[PDB]
Amino acid sequence: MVKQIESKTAFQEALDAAGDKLVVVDFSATWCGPCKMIKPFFHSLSEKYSNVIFLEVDVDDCQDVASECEVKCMPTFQFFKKGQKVGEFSGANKEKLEATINELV
Q: How many CB atoms lie within 10 A of CB 7?
A: 12
Say if CB 81 and CB 20 are below 8 A apart: yes
Over its C-alpha atoms, the chain yields an Rg (Å, rounded) of 12
Task: Report in angstroms the alpha-carbon separations of 72 from 21, 39, 75, 82, 83.
Answer: 25, 19, 9, 23, 20
Query: Looking at the domain that runs over 1-105, which CATH code has it been given?
Result: 3.40.30.10
DSSP calls for 5-72: E-SHHHHHHHHHHTTTS-EEEEEE-TT-HHHHHHHHHHHHHHHH-TTSEEEEEETTT-HHHHHHTT--
Is 32 one of the annotated active-site residues of the chain? yes
Which amino acid, residue 38?
I
The answer to whether residues 55 and 24 touch, using CB atoms and an 8 Å cutoff, is yes
Please pick, among 32, 62, 69, 73, the residue that the annotation labels catalytic. Answer: 32
What is the chain's length? 105
CA distances from 66 to 8, 69, 94 (A): 9, 5, 22
The structure's method of determination equals X-ray
The question of whether 35 is a catalytic residue gets the answer yes
Q: Give this entry's resolution in angstroms.
A: 1.6
Domains of the chain, residue spans: 1-105
Is residue 101 within 8 A of residue 44, CB to CB? The reply is no
